[PDB]
Symmetry: none
Subunit: 402 residues, 2 copies
């Protein structure tokens, strides 16, 4: 069965991330041991201790971090914990024999890296953990902020379904309000086709935004169509973060393996800033070039046929690192990825039978998104079963009787 | 009278009464999971996982949009082998019993005894009465100004108080079930 593996993003962490998985399998225990040994040797903390317990504060090699509700909620540590848990779950699935081999890899804004490390193996988990921790540490200080720690950017989720607004004109409406207020407003996450979007921007702009949304809401009907995302105060996937892209590209070039097999991802990886299936086609490169600037990619466009003939691996690596670097600056396009995954083969789209995500039982966000998209009236005959790697372990591993 | 079988419908009722700090009597049939949460997705995930754990079942299609009648029907159809007190409900009821009977020191069995000997009823009525005592003896305020706790105010501290609360719970349970 042609399947898809979706790895969730932020907002999924919670104390004791699937320790039951660590206790159940023997491969999950091994990968947990390797990960925590490496992270305590190199980074300076015990990811196992950060996950099993939720310490209020920890001391890394040189510096120390704290958080009123556990260090697990900081970007770096939540990132490493998520990556480790996803790797453990995938290893457990694979050792039990219930893990299809040629599955296509996709993920949410940050799960993409874990998905690549897990279901494709293009790079090992160690480099993933190291680069993720370093980048997460660098991210928190990429935006000027008050000495009190407050920043000048927030993001909130809107539900334009009950405003009567349609999908087509949502970006137009956001741009109109931005022009009216003369502030910085930008779509970031296109999660659900009709009734979910994420908008990040300045403060006053956000205030104008939910004021207008509430006025329209009271005009039409009560839905509570605006939720201010808490804690996070950095405009991820926005244009403003396009200054740190160069350093991230340099780091990826430094760490990414030199000799890699493009066949390991071609037709097997759904990037985010460009939803189309990863492919070695001039049109795909042109699209990734004109969507966002990419100087190292320009030399690809000038000469393509000969370069493809002579340096397939090198050009594939260049496009891969360019995509991976630019991903964290451009909005995610989950709507396009979902539609490409669920549309049947006849209508120019991948026909996926099962859509299983490597998540957690507590907060299955991506599974909720998939189910919500499927229950839309656009397609009601789609036989695309949606699974969660923890809620439906019984049916995923095929150990369910009646 | 005939004992009342506490089925998956009653367990779901207890669960969405506890999650929203609501009362079984104050919730109406047309109430849906969406209506009580007022669109709060944060509570939606927790409530859905709690219902799944109580029913030992996975995804419940349409649970968010299905009304209380449809929710009860589907949980009864699916959770045919429901166990009297699942994890979520077990911890909720027992913790509330501790926090309301600390000074009194009475145990859940005593409550059931009043439904067996004092009231001459079966075990299902005892479980329903314990659930009602746990729900109505909590502290706080309702979402829309209703009385958060109807049976008692504060933690019980004497045998008479707990006995009268149990009697009121039996009376209310009979009234809602027409007994």
């Amino acid at each position: 069965p042609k399947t898809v593996y979706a790895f969730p993003g932020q907002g999924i962490q919670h104390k004791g991330m699937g320790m039951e998985v660590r206790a159940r399998s023997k491969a999950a225990r091994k990968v947990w041991d390797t990960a925590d040994k490496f992270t305590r040797d190199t980074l300076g903390f015990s990811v196992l201790h950060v996950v099993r317990d939720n310490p209020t504060s920890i001391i890394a090699s040189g510096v120390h971090y704290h958080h009123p509700d556990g260090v697990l909620y900081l970007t770096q540590f939540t990132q490493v914990a998520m990556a480790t848990v996803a790797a453990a779950q995938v290893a457990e699935m694979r050792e039990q024999g219930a893990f299809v081999e040629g599955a296509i890899a996709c993920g949410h804004s940050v799960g993409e890296y874990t998905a690549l490390a897990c279901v494709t193996g293009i790079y090992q988990l160690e480099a993933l953990l190291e680069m993720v921790f370093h980048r997460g540490s660098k991210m928190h200080d990429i935006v000027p902020r008050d000495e009190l720690g407050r920043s000048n950017y927030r993001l909130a989720a809107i539900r334009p379904s009950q405003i009567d607004l349609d999908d087509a004109d949502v970006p137009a409406f956001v741009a109109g309000i931005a022009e009216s207020t003369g502030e910085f407003l930008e779509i970031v996450n296109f999660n659900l086709r009709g009734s979910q979007y994420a908008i990040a921007g300045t403060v006053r702009g956000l205030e104008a935004l939910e004021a207008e949304v509430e006025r329209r809401r009271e005009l039409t009907g009560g839905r509570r169509s605006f939720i201010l995302v808490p804690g996070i105060d950095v405009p991820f996937h926005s244009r403003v973060l396009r200054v740190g892209v160069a350093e991230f590209r340099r780091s990826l070039d430094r760490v990414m393996p030199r000799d890699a097999d493009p066949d390991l991802i071609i037709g097997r990886y759904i990037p985010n800033l460009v939803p189309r299936l990863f492919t070695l086609d001039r049109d795909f490169i042109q699209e990734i070039r004109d969507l966002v600037p990419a100087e190292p990619l320009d030399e690809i466009l000038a000469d393509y046929d000969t370069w493809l003939r002579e340096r397939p691996r090198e050009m594939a690596r260049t496009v891969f690192i360019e995509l991976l670097a630019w991903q964290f600056a451009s909005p995610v396009r989950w709507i396009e990825t979902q539609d490409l995954l669920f549309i049947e083969e006849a209508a120019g789209g991948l026909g996926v039978e099962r859509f299983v995500e490597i998540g957690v039982k507590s907060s299955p966000t991506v599974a909720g998104l998939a189910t919500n998209t499927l229950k839309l009236p656009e397609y009601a005959h789609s036989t695309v079963e949606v699974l969660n790697a923890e809620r439906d372990a019984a049916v995923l591993f095929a150990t369910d009787t009646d």
